[PDB]
Amino acid sequence: NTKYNKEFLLYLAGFVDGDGSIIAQINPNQSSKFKHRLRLTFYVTQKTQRRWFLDKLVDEIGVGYVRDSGSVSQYVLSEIKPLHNFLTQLQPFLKLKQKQANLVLKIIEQLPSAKESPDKFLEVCTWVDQIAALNDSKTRKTTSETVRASNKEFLLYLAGFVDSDGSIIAQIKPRQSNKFKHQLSLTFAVTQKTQRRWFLDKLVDEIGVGYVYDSGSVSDYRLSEIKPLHNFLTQLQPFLKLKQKQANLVLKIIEQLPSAKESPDKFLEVCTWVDQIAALNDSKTRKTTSETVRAVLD
DNA sequence: TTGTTCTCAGGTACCTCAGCCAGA
DNA sequence: TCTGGCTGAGGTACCTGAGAACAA
Length: 298
Ligand SMILES: [Ca+2]
Ligand SMILES: [Ca+2]
Description:
This protein has helices at residues 6-19, 51-61, 80-90, 98-109, 111-114, 118-134, 144-147, 151-165, 197-207, 226-236, 244-255, 257-260, 264-280, 290-293; strands spanning 20-28, 36-47, 65-69, 72-77, 166-174, 182-193, 211-215, 218-223. It is an alpha+beta fold. The chain has 2 domains: 1-149, Endonuclease I-creI; 150-298, Endonuclease I-creI (Roll), CATH 3.10.28.10. The protein has a 4-stranded antiparallel sheet with strand order 1-2-4-3. The protein binds calcium ion (2 copies). One calcium ion binds at residues 19, 164-165.
């Protein structure tokens, strides 16, 4: 049994709450004693361009594997002993997926019994149900019914959730009344299905600043005020693993706003910093760029 | 002339299942 | 009959922009 470092577990619990998945399944199976086979899996998905991150996990956790699916990759752990050992250690730090974790640990321990009785098996399948109910389940076929046949601790965890479900954005917004016809915009955002808004609300309390906004079926925590933002990113930046470049770039920009609102040179140079931030992001619908701002030649 | 609030939306990058096979 | 490595995809729940309007 490997013991995992607490700091590793804090960050990881956040990223897992963000991009991870804790899953239990009943596999239709003729060979199986009860025509069904239970699978338990922990997943971390990420764009293949960042599979190094998932490759790190394999090394740090020390078990599991990484697979590709064209554009997107996954870390996967289904081996039972190690899975229980890992989840046992991770669950105290989970906030969104903690109930799932614990249910998967219960199932794992009750296994030996489940396989030696039709009735014990059934009960266990009703835990798989529960887990699926907790997840954003949408394509599940085989169900049990079928079978009837401390500030550093918060910043480490918050870095994790931010590296996964969050976004550090910098924008150049076209505007007539602006001295150089464009307005700089910096934003820290965290996104979440509106049914977990209570979580983005918690952030407003813990961070001290910002607001939660709703739209369609999702909500955002957003932070755009130049001061608070600089304060926050200065604190949070040491603990980021995917978005550290973006965080610094935003701090470097904020520090050079003074001299940027003075000369068309500094302004256009700071615009290239915005370009770099979007390059680093998974940018897809960006319109106004620095080259655009180079119409300032007019 | 600037900062900020508040909502919307394109295009995925996730999540959460589905399943087959070889080995012991 | 059991376990773990490996593969495919449905349908969002995110990310990362956009811009109109309020408040200075
Ligand atoms: Ca998520
Ligand atoms: Ca992500």
